[PDB]
Design a binder for this molecule. Structure first.
Ligand SMILES: Cn1cnc2c(N)nc[n+](C)c21
Length: 215
Protein backbone atom coordinates (compact mmCIF):
# COMPACT_ATOMS: atom_id res chain seq x y z
CA UNK A 1 0.00 0.00 0.00
CA UNK A 2 1.56 3.22 -1.29
CA UNK A 3 0.14 6.38 -2.82
CA UNK A 4 0.66 5.17 -6.37
CA UNK A 5 -1.59 2.18 -5.69
CA UNK A 6 -4.11 4.64 -4.21
CA UNK A 7 -3.85 6.94 -7.23
CA UNK A 8 -4.60 4.11 -9.64
CA UNK A 9 -7.58 2.89 -7.59
CA UNK A 10 -8.91 6.48 -7.31
CA UNK A 11 -8.33 7.14 -10.98
CA UNK A 12 -10.42 4.06 -11.93
CA UNK A 13 -13.47 5.60 -10.20
CA UNK A 14 -13.61 8.63 -12.50
CA UNK A 15 -14.27 11.00 -9.61
CA UNK A 16 -13.24 13.99 -11.71
CA UNK A 17 -15.44 13.25 -14.74
CA UNK A 18 -17.20 16.61 -14.40
CA UNK A 19 -14.33 18.68 -12.90
CA UNK A 20 -12.03 21.22 -14.63
CA UNK A 21 -8.48 20.20 -15.60
CA UNK A 22 -6.80 21.18 -12.30
CA UNK A 23 -9.92 20.30 -10.23
CA UNK A 24 -9.92 23.64 -8.35
CA UNK A 25 -12.15 26.06 -10.34
CA UNK A 26 -10.10 28.90 -11.87
CA UNK A 27 -6.81 27.26 -10.99
CA UNK A 28 -3.60 29.16 -11.74
CA UNK A 29 -5.32 32.49 -11.14
CA UNK A 30 -5.56 34.95 -8.23
CA UNK A 31 -9.01 33.56 -7.44
CA UNK A 32 -7.46 30.17 -6.60
CA UNK A 33 -5.23 31.88 -4.03
CA UNK A 34 -8.23 33.69 -2.59
CA UNK A 35 -10.06 30.36 -2.36
CA UNK A 36 -7.14 28.56 -0.78
CA UNK A 37 -7.22 31.08 2.12
CA UNK A 38 -11.00 31.28 2.44
CA UNK A 39 -11.59 27.50 2.41
CA UNK A 40 -9.74 27.03 5.77
CA UNK A 41 -12.12 25.65 8.41
CA UNK A 42 -15.11 25.84 6.08
CA UNK A 43 -16.81 24.15 3.11
CA UNK A 44 -15.87 25.09 -0.41
CA UNK A 45 -19.50 25.79 -1.36
CA UNK A 46 -19.33 28.75 1.09
CA UNK A 47 -16.03 29.85 -0.50
CA UNK A 48 -17.79 29.98 -3.89
CA UNK A 49 -20.39 32.35 -2.35
CA UNK A 50 -17.71 34.71 -0.97
CA UNK A 51 -16.01 34.72 -4.39
CA UNK A 52 -19.32 35.48 -6.10
CA UNK A 53 -19.80 38.37 -3.63
CA UNK A 54 -16.41 39.79 -4.60
CA UNK A 55 -17.22 39.33 -8.27
CA UNK A 56 -20.70 40.86 -7.94
CA UNK A 57 -19.23 43.91 -6.19
CA UNK A 58 -16.64 44.25 -8.99
CA UNK A 59 -13.79 43.86 -6.46
CA UNK A 60 -12.61 40.84 -8.42
CA UNK A 61 -12.70 41.32 -12.23
CA UNK A 62 -10.68 39.90 -15.13
CA UNK A 63 -7.16 41.28 -14.47
CA UNK A 64 -5.25 39.48 -11.69
CA UNK A 65 -2.70 42.27 -11.18
CA UNK A 66 -5.56 44.71 -10.64
CA UNK A 67 -7.32 42.16 -8.39
CA UNK A 68 -4.16 41.77 -6.25
CA UNK A 69 -3.92 45.51 -5.68
CA UNK A 70 -7.71 45.73 -5.01
CA UNK A 71 -7.36 43.27 -2.11
CA UNK A 72 -4.16 44.84 -0.80
CA UNK A 73 -5.88 48.24 -0.54
CA UNK A 74 -9.55 47.41 0.06
CA UNK A 75 -11.11 48.88 3.19
CA UNK A 76 -10.93 46.10 5.84
CA UNK A 77 -14.59 46.26 6.85
CA UNK A 78 -15.78 46.01 3.23
CA UNK A 79 -13.71 42.91 2.56
CA UNK A 80 -14.85 41.36 5.83
CA UNK A 81 -18.49 41.80 4.84
CA UNK A 82 -18.04 40.25 1.38
CA UNK A 83 -16.37 37.08 2.74
CA UNK A 84 -18.96 36.48 5.46
CA UNK A 85 -20.26 33.26 3.82
CA UNK A 86 -16.99 31.42 4.35
CA UNK A 87 -16.83 32.32 8.05
CA UNK A 88 -14.06 33.71 10.31
CA UNK A 89 -14.51 36.69 8.05
CA UNK A 90 -12.74 39.40 10.09
CA UNK A 91 -9.72 37.11 10.48
CA UNK A 92 -9.82 36.05 6.83
CA UNK A 93 -10.19 39.58 5.53
CA UNK A 94 -7.14 40.69 7.54
CA UNK A 95 -5.23 37.57 6.44
CA UNK A 96 -5.99 38.38 2.73
CA UNK A 97 -5.22 42.09 3.01
CA UNK A 98 -1.93 41.54 4.84
CA UNK A 99 -1.04 38.69 2.47
CA UNK A 100 -1.89 40.74 -0.64
CA UNK A 101 0.03 43.80 0.66
CA UNK A 102 3.01 41.57 1.46
CA UNK A 103 2.90 39.91 -2.00
CA UNK A 104 3.13 43.42 -3.55
CA UNK A 105 5.88 44.45 -1.13
CA UNK A 106 8.05 41.37 -1.67
CA UNK A 107 7.16 40.29 -5.23
CA UNK A 108 5.86 43.47 -6.95
CA UNK A 109 3.26 41.49 -8.97
CA UNK A 110 1.08 38.40 -8.83
CA UNK A 111 2.90 37.06 -11.91
CA UNK A 112 6.29 37.28 -10.15
CA UNK A 113 4.78 35.95 -6.91
CA UNK A 114 3.79 32.74 -8.73
CA UNK A 115 7.39 32.25 -9.85
CA UNK A 116 9.25 33.23 -6.67
CA UNK A 117 6.99 32.33 -3.70
CA UNK A 118 8.17 29.67 -1.23
CA UNK A 119 6.29 27.71 1.37
CA UNK A 120 8.25 29.48 4.15
CA UNK A 121 7.31 32.93 2.85
CA UNK A 122 3.66 31.86 2.91
CA UNK A 123 3.99 30.35 6.40
CA UNK A 124 5.40 33.74 7.60
CA UNK A 125 2.12 35.37 6.54
CA UNK A 126 0.03 35.54 9.73
CA UNK A 127 -2.90 33.12 9.66
CA UNK A 128 -1.75 31.03 6.66
CA UNK A 129 -1.34 27.39 7.67
CA UNK A 130 0.32 24.55 5.79
CA UNK A 131 -2.83 23.45 4.01
CA UNK A 132 -3.67 26.93 2.71
CA UNK A 133 -0.04 27.65 1.89
CA UNK A 134 0.17 24.36 -0.06
CA UNK A 135 -3.08 24.92 -1.91
CA UNK A 136 -1.73 28.33 -3.02
CA UNK A 137 1.54 26.69 -4.16
CA UNK A 138 -0.10 23.91 -6.10
CA UNK A 139 -3.44 25.39 -7.28
CA UNK A 140 -2.51 29.07 -7.77
CA UNK A 141 1.21 28.69 -8.52
CA UNK A 142 1.51 25.28 -10.35
CA UNK A 143 4.18 24.10 -7.88
CA UNK A 144 4.90 20.40 -7.42
CA UNK A 145 3.17 20.16 -4.05
CA UNK A 146 0.37 17.83 -2.96
CA UNK A 147 -2.10 19.35 -0.50
CA UNK A 148 -3.09 17.12 2.35
CA UNK A 149 -5.76 17.80 4.97
CA UNK A 150 -8.17 16.14 7.39
CA UNK A 151 -9.87 14.31 4.48
CA UNK A 152 -6.54 12.70 3.43
CA UNK A 153 -5.68 11.80 7.05
CA UNK A 154 -9.03 9.99 7.50
CA UNK A 155 -8.99 8.41 4.04
CA UNK A 156 -5.54 6.89 4.67
CA UNK A 157 -6.35 5.95 8.25
CA UNK A 158 -9.28 3.91 6.93
CA UNK A 159 -6.92 2.10 4.50
CA UNK A 160 -4.75 1.14 7.51
CA UNK A 161 -2.07 3.87 7.58
CA UNK A 162 -2.23 6.55 10.25
CA UNK A 163 -0.15 9.72 9.73
CA UNK A 164 -1.13 12.61 11.99
CA UNK A 165 1.71 15.05 11.15
CA UNK A 166 0.81 17.20 8.13
CA UNK A 167 4.29 17.10 6.59
CA UNK A 168 4.73 13.29 6.95
CA UNK A 169 1.25 12.63 5.45
CA UNK A 170 2.10 14.90 2.53
CA UNK A 171 5.43 13.12 2.09
CA UNK A 172 3.62 9.74 2.08
CA UNK A 173 1.37 11.00 -0.67
CA UNK A 174 4.08 12.68 -2.72
CA UNK A 175 6.61 9.86 -2.44
CA UNK A 176 4.49 7.04 -3.93
CA UNK A 177 4.10 9.23 -7.02
CA UNK A 178 7.76 10.31 -7.16
CA UNK A 179 8.78 6.63 -6.86
CA UNK A 180 6.53 5.64 -9.77
CA UNK A 181 6.72 8.84 -11.71
CA UNK A 182 6.67 7.46 -15.26
CA UNK A 183 3.84 5.00 -14.41
CA UNK A 184 1.82 7.78 -12.70
CA UNK A 185 2.24 10.15 -15.64
CA UNK A 186 1.44 7.30 -18.08
CA UNK A 187 -2.01 6.99 -16.45
CA UNK A 188 -2.65 10.23 -18.36
CA UNK A 189 -0.37 9.69 -21.41
CA UNK A 190 2.25 12.36 -20.63
CA UNK A 191 -0.42 15.04 -21.35
CA UNK A 192 -0.09 16.62 -17.84
CA UNK A 193 2.57 17.89 -15.42
CA UNK A 194 3.30 16.49 -11.99
CA UNK A 195 1.88 19.66 -10.41
CA UNK A 196 -1.36 19.02 -12.31
CA UNK A 197 -1.22 15.37 -11.25
CA UNK A 198 -1.07 16.37 -7.52
CA UNK A 199 -3.74 18.98 -8.17
CA UNK A 200 -6.01 16.17 -9.44
CA UNK A 201 -4.93 13.52 -6.92
CA UNK A 202 -5.79 15.74 -3.96
CA UNK A 203 -9.05 16.52 -5.79
CA UNK A 204 -9.80 12.80 -6.09
CA UNK A 205 -9.32 12.27 -2.35
CA UNK A 206 -11.58 15.23 -1.57
CA UNK A 207 -14.35 14.06 -4.00
CA UNK A 208 -14.03 10.47 -2.80
CA UNK A 209 -14.29 11.73 0.79
CA UNK A 210 -17.23 14.08 0.09
CA UNK A 211 -19.03 11.24 -1.74
CA UNK A 212 -18.58 8.79 1.21
CA UNK A 213 -17.30 6.04 -1.14
CA UNK A 214 -15.38 2.77 -0.50
CA UNK A 215 -12.04 1.82 -2.14
C1 LIG B 1 -10.79 23.23 -1.75
N1 LIG B 1 -11.44 22.98 -3.05
C2 LIG B 1 -11.18 23.39 -4.33
N2 LIG B 1 -12.06 22.92 -5.27
C3 LIG B 1 -12.93 22.17 -4.47
C4 LIG B 1 -14.04 21.43 -4.75
N3 LIG B 1 -14.42 21.38 -6.05
N4 LIG B 1 -14.70 20.78 -3.73
C5 LIG B 1 -14.30 20.84 -2.45
N5 LIG B 1 -13.22 21.56 -2.09
C6 LIG B 1 -12.77 21.61 -0.68
C7 LIG B 1 -12.51 22.23 -3.11
Amino acid sequence: LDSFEILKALKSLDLLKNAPAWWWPNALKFEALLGAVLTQNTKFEAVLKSLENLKNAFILENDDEINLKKIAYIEFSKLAECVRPSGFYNQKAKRLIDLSGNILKDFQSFENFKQEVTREWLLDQKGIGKESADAILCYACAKEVMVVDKYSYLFLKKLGIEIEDYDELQHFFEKGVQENLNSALALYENTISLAQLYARFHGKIVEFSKQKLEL
